[PDB]
Amino acid sequence: TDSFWEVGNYKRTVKRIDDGHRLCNDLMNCVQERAKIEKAYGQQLTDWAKRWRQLIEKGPQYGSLERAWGAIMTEADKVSELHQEVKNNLLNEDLEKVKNWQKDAYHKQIMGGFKETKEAEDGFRKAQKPWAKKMKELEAAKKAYHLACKEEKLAMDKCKQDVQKTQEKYEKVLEDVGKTTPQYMENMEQVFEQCQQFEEKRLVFLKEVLLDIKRHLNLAENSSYIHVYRELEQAIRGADAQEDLRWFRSTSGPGMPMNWPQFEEW
Amino acid sequence: TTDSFWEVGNYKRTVKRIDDGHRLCNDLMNCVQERAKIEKAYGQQLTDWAKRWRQLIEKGPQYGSLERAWGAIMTEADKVSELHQEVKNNLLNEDLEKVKNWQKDAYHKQIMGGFKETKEAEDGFRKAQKPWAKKMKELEAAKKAYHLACKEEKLAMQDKVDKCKQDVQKTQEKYEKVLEDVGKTTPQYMENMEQVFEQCQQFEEKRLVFLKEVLLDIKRHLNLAENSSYIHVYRELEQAIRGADAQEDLRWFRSTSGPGMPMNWPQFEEWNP
Ligand SMILES: [Ca+2]
Ligand SMILES: [Ca+2]
Numbered sequence: 001t002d003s004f005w006e007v008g009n010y011k012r013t014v015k016r017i018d019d020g021h022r023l024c025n026d027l028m029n030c031v032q033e034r035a036k037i038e039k040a041y042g043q044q045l046t047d048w049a050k051r052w053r054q055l056i057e058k059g060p061q062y063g064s065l066e067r068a069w070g071a072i073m074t075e076a077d078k079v080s081e082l083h084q085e086v087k088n089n090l091l092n093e094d095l096e097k098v099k100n101w102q103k104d105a106y107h108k109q110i111m112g113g114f115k116e117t118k119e120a121e122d123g124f125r126k127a128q129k130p131w132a133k134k135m136k137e138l139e140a141a142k143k144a145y146h147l148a149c150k151e152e153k154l155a156m157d158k159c160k161q162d163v164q165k166t167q168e169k170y171e172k173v174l175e176d177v178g179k180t181t182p183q184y185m186e187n188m189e190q191v192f193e194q195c196q197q198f199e200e201k202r203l204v205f206l207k208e209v210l211l212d213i214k215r216h217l218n219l220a221e222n223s224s225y226i227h228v229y230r231e232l233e234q235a236i237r238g239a240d241a242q243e244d245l246r247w248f249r250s251t252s253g254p255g256m257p258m259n260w261p262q263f264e265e266w
Numbered sequence: 267t268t269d270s271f272w273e274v275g276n277y278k279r280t281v282k283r284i285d286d287g288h289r290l291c292n293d294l295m296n297c298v299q300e301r302a303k304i305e306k307a308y309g310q311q312l313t314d315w316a317k318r319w320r321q322l323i324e325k326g327p328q329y330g331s332l333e334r335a336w337g338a339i340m341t342e343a344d345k346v347s348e349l350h351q352e353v354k355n356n357l358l359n360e361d362l363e364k365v366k367n368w369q370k371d372a373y374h375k376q377i378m379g380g381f382k383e384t385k386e387a388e389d390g391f392r393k394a395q396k397p398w399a400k401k402m403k404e405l406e407a408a409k410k411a412y413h414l415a416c417k418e419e420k421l422a423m424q425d426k427v428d429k430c431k432q433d434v435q436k437t438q439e440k441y442e443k444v445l446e447d448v449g450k451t452t453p454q455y456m457e458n459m460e461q462v463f464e465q466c467q468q469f470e471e472k473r474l475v476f477l478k479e480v481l482l483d484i485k486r487h488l489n490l491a492e493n494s495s496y497i498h499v500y501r502e503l504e505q506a507i508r509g510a511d512a513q514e515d516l517r518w519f520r521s522t523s524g525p526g527m528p529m530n531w532p533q534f535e536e537w538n539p
Contacts, residue, residue, distance in 0.1 A: 005529040012523050019327040026326060027336075030319055034343075037315060041308040048304060052297050059293060060286035065474055068481055069294075075488065076301075138532060149537035170534075177532060192524055196516050203512040206332050210507050213339065218503075220496040229489040236481050241474035245467050252279050253467075254460050258272035261405060261448055263441075266413075 010124040024102040035090040042083035049076040063244030071235040078228040089216035127187035141170040277391040291369040302357035305350045312347035316340040330515035338506035345499045356487035390462035398455045408441040
């Protein structure tokens with residue numbers, strides 16, 4: 001009853017066509033939303049780097065340790081930058097890739113749906129029509145047979161002569177679907193198969209696009225990411241306690257020059 | 267010259283570095299807390315989006331491998347979020363705590379103001395400078411009185427100026443004497459001054475050595491590539507995607523929804539009842 005082969009149930013295959021277009025929509029929003037998220041994190045990082053760069057500067061921390069601490073603000077700028085690159089790929093490549101695929105792939109016609117949906121719809125309607133008509137008729141038949149046996153019940157007459165003519169109409173219409181069935185089957189097989197081909201393009205494209213996206217997301221492949229931490233670490237390792245102590249000593253402590261009191265005149 | 271450490275009072279700056287040290291801990295802790303809040307905001311956002319798209323994709327019409335491959339991206343988002351939630355965690359519960367506890371063992375607020383350790387040095391430096399604060403005011407005294415008798419000498423042009431050439435002798439003698447005494451006692455001043463400053467350097471060193479340790483701690487918590495983990499999540503994604511089979515997905519719709527579906531082709535059926 002639910003089977004493809006019953007009248008009208010080819011519609012699921014048709015519905016699927018409409019679906020693909022919408023599914024391009026869904027994916028495009030998916031990416032945009034993702035990019036928004038990356039954008040927010042890069043943004044919040046630069047704001048932070050900017051806060052702290054300024055607070056370290058203005059503040060009493062001095063020396064190489066001021067610079068080491070400052071370096072973290074340098075990672076936050078770099079990382080921020082990588083996330084903005086992610087956002088820009090997501091948006092400029094992948095979304096535009098999908099936008100383009102959809103545009104060239106579905107055609108709004110007039111009205112009034114996509115052209116690729118209607119072609120399928122018309123193909124199925126044409127493949128199912130003789131058959132659908134035979135199927136209504138075969139239907140009408142059985143009951144007239146289901147109407148001439150049961151009839152024999154009370155009057156049991158032109159009764160065994162009306163079994164013998166509704167039974168043969170029925171039997172003959174039956175014989176005749178038997179005959180139209182393999183064409184009816186060949187014909188469905190074709191529209192359907194043209195539908196698989198279209199859907200296959202879309203799915204093949206999807207798989208490619210997902211991969212594009214994985215790549216634009218994978219910060220941890222890229223050398224730059226691995227490098228910002230190689231570089232942060234060595235900057236901190238650069239800081240010397242003893243260095244800043246000596247610096248304070250000579251610029252602010254006992255190491256400063258003094259003009260020791262002498263004799264004066266005038 | 268006059269902003270020298272050696273001038274009276276200028277030991278202040280070494281005493282103030284001590285306080286600065288306390289506030290610098292506080293600055294670092296804010297810096298860290300603030301960083302952490304940012305990491306968690308990204309966590310939540312990813313988590314949110316993953317939840318959103320997991321449902322939209324499920325309730326949506328995409329089926330088969332490509333449903334799974336797509337949905338797999340939500341999975342990365344969850345794990346990346348997990349990772350940034352860990353960063354936040356290390357920042358907050360290890361690094362912010364580490365400094366906070368150090369700060370706690372290092373400075374000791376006194377009931378009525380200041381840190382025990384600031385006053386140590388204020389006192390060291392006062393006491394080391396007191397003898398020389400005197401001499402230095404005495405020297406000022408002599409230098410002044412001296413020029414008195416000296417300038418008093420020269421506004422004039424046995425004779426009249428007998429005293430003007432002698433009192434000079436009286437103070438110049440004293441100025442000269444004090445000047446000697448100063449010189450004679452400068453080394454005890456230096457050695458004492460230097461002694462205190464040395465307690466201060468030792469202190470700051472502790473802080474700086476610790477500061478460095480913590481910054482390194484923070485870097486390790488920040489570094490996502492400290493993580494075969496971070497790489498895993500991308501590997502696992504790519505696998506899930508390359509797993510997608512289009513022709514397999516089409517087969518499934520064929521038998522699920524199309525021609526390969528079962529069918530009771532019409533047969534004869536008797537009256538029965
Ligand atoms: Ca500074
Ligand atoms: Ca679905």
